[PDB]
Amino acid sequence: VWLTQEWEDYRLTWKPEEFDNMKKVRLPSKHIWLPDVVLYNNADGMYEVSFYSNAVVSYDGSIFWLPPAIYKSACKIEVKHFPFDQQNCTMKFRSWTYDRTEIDLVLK
Amino acid sequence: ETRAHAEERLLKKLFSGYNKWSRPVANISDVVLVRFGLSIAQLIDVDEKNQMMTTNVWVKQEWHDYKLRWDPADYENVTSIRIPSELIWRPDIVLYNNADGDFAVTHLTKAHLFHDGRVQWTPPAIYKSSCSIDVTFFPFDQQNCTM
Ligand SMILES: *[C@@H]1O[C@H](CO)[C@@H](O)[C@H](O)[C@H]1NC(C)=O
Ligand SMILES: *[C@@H]1O[C@H](CO)[C@@H](O)[C@H](O)[C@H]1NC(C)=O
Ligand SMILES: *[C@@H]1O[C@H](CO)[C@@H](O)[C@H](O)[C@H]1NC(C)=O
Ligand SMILES: [Ca+2]
């Protein structure tokens, strides 16, 4: 999967005209504040994303982050109609650092 | 006046003279009281043949640090912060009966620090432990695996 994430960091703004009309730059995600969103129902105990890619920052303070991830989630398998069965496997994503009082999660 | 400057000031104050290799007690004779609790997320596997048990748990730990204290009135009523756990002293809790895994917590998430010194740290962990398996009444058996 690609875990697309977007938020506003007001401290990462700039006036484009002072910087040769640049509208966005890439900053290393390791060097900026990140919302620690991960998959809780993973099996094998892997939570984070695979690579920690770069983040695209806009001149107005908007952050767009698109890191890749290999996830091994656990799901209930229904065997009643095997091999004509359909499975319903869920993936739950949460902030392991911040609760609802500090960050809100919203579906794009 | 925004909370961000106040938190930055608080952080610069807390870790000015902080040593993370030092047991956080004012008096040498004092004992660090660590409240320890487990929370099982799932029972990944019970390996009867290899006599091993894989679990996914949250290791809840709580103690007091006498150097990480402040008055919220002087920092815009900031009562608690989240900090990386690798910046502070932590207890060295290890699983004795480890088998085919890690002894200690390896994830090192962020710790919740309150203004009275309380530190709350709840990293996740996947443990593979040893437990003798009794199969007298298989498949009606009841196993008793310890940690
Ligand atoms: C530490 O506690 C002991 C009693 O257990 C006391 O005799 C000693 O004076 C204390 N030291 C300090 C520096 O408070
Ligand atoms: C300060 O923070 C506490 C805890 O968040 C809150 O209950 C209180 O209303 C805030 N304001 C004052 C003046 O204490
Ligand atoms: C499970 O094993 C532990 C360790 O030997 C023992 O203390 C406990 O009483 C046992 N419980 C049962 C129900 O057998
Ligand atoms: Ca098994």
- In this complex, do A47 and B124 lie within 8 Å of one another by their Cβ atoms? yes
Ligand 3 atom nearest the C-alpha of B144 is 1
Compute φ and ψ for B34, nearest 5 degrees: -110, 115
The DSSP letter of residue B7 is: H
Integer Cα distance of A86 and A79 in angstroms: 9
Output the CA angle B91-B28-B85, nearest 5 degrees: 25
Structure's resolution in angstroms: 2.6
Distance (Å, whole) CA B10 – CA B25: 21
Is B126–A11 a contact, with Cβ atoms under 8 angstroms apart?
no
Nearest to B143 by CA among B130, B124, B125, B126: B130
Burial (CB < 10 A; 0-12, 13-18, 19+), residue B2, is: exposed
Facing residue for B44 by CB, picked from A40, A43, A97: A43
Residue with token string 């199969």? B135
Residue A45 to residue B124, Cβ atoms within 8 A: yes
Whether A29 contacts A47, CB under 8 Å: no
Q: Which residue type, as a one-letter code, is found at position A23? A: K
Does residue B27's CB lie within 6 angstroms of at least one atom of ligand 1? Answer: yes
Which method, experimentally, gave rise to this model? cryo-EM
**Burial class of residue B120, CB neighbours in 10 A (0-12, 13-18, 19+):** middle
Tell me, rounded to whole angstroms, the distance of Cα A50 from its chain centroid.
11
